[PDB]
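tl;dr need the bound structure. longer version: we got a ligand (zinc ion) that a collaborator sent over and nobodys looked at where it sits. i said id run it. heres the input, straight from their email, havent touched it
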Amino acid sequence: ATLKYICAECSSKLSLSRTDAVRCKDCGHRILLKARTKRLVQFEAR
Amino acid sequence: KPQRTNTLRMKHGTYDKLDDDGLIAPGVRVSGEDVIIGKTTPISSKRDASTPLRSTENGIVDQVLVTTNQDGLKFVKVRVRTTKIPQIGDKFASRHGQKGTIG
Amino acid sequence: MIVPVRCFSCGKVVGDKWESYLNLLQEDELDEGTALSRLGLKRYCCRRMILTHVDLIEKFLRYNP
Amino acid sequence: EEGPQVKIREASKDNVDFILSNVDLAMANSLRRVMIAEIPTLAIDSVEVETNTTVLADEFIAHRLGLIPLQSMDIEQLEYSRDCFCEDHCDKCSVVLTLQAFGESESTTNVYSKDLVIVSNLMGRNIGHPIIQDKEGNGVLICKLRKGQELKLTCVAKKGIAKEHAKWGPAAAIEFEYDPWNKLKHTDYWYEQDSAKEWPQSKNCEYEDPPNEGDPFDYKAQADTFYMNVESVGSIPVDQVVVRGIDTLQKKVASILLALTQMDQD
Amino acid sequence: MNAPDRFELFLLGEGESKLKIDPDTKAPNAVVITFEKEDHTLGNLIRAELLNDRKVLFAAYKVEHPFFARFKLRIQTTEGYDPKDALKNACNSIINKLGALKTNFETEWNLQTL
Ligand SMILES: [Zn+2]
Ligand SMILES: [Zn+2]
Ligand SMILES: [Zn+2]
């Protein structure tokens, strides 16, 4: 049901706003990856 | 995302690519001088200080990473991926101290 | 990373012959020289493809995400 | 049949090792070029990457996809996107493949052209089927997934010439030789002591008479008899490479004769 | 970025013809033709056919730069022999030679088992 930020280590799809600091659920991994886009990247197969 | 208010101090690269958290999310193709880390600063309302993509460069975003320092500062790290295809000019060396370009 | 699909030089589909080569090696205890000739790779241009190849992916699929 | 004359040595689904005879080197080459160059063919040329948690990057993947040979038997029955009056791609000019794969097992999920699925109506023309030549139905090894890594792709195979990108090339190698016995003296054999004793004899020395040492250099003897050998990549049956080679060359000159014609009028 | 789209090699972009015909000035009964989006494939072919033809005094072709897909072709034909007709003629001469090969091949291909 939508994801804004994955988290670095547990891969647990977080998604938090401002003043949430930078942590994850159980794995307070202060890192967090930014998860992809849905805007479908197209590619040249060349 | 900055969209100009009272200083308008921004760069020619398009912000059309930054999300509403001011960060391109992975996958998004970025080129020209496209803005990557859309940042803003009130100085003594919106003085844009932001990292646009390097001029000559153009890629696709590989990973945006948001962190915390020891002073707790918010960190962002954008990896921008580009596939580089041997062209004319690219430099190639055998293993005996002779380089040479593709003519 | 993984097997190039085609031998650079000429374009033999080489990337359909990597597991089979790894087999020709491990399960059939053959040597690369003999093994590569069996996969049909006859011109060194296509041999160097498989024989030179480093399958770093099997090390990339070892990290978690 | 008077003129150029083929004389096949081997024939397989992969090879056509033949002997062109009674032709100008020019032509024998010209065809050799056409085969490497300009036989039209179908090949994934656009990838839309839906999900890819795989270890490889999209364009990496995308690249290889394009390199997986596809069925091109009925490629004339397909138009180059660029001429097809549609808008982008449609079944008239384009086959549309899919790759969906999830690392399901805790073992390493391999991914293959086999896992490519045509999602467009082919309208009966043999086209765009991932060519599988391997002995376990897998075909080209596209990617490797760990348990929990997904790959969702939409490819689009379009009609192209190897000249546009060597991915559309139906030929693999194209062996090619003439004058196995260096009788036209077309080469000056480099040597430390003995021209003859150092250079290994060709395949095709067997198919031709060794010159007599007493003879004068045959000055008038032009190059005919060219021992070729077309290897196919799979996208088109070898026999057909050689044909469309001779065919597409025929079309070219034809494209010119029509220009010398339609050069007049208005 | 500078890299010209690879199609530009076999595909005519706008305003370009296949053939530009120029009347060689330097000599009588000679012509220079510029094929656009062709290369040696054709050049060396047409030339060495053009060259067989006996009422052709001169045939040569050159691709002046590897970057561009085009080549020039010069044919000097005898007085009263039109080079365009020599081309036409050497062109036909090819089409017929390839027909033969196409045949001969498909023929000798069928006799093969595998
Ligand atoms: Zn976590
Ligand atoms: Zn090769
Ligand atoms: Zn279409």
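gonna send this back to them w/ a short note. Residues 1-85 of chain B form a domain with the OB fold (Dihydrolipoamide Acetyltransferase, E2P) fold (CATH 2.40.50.150).
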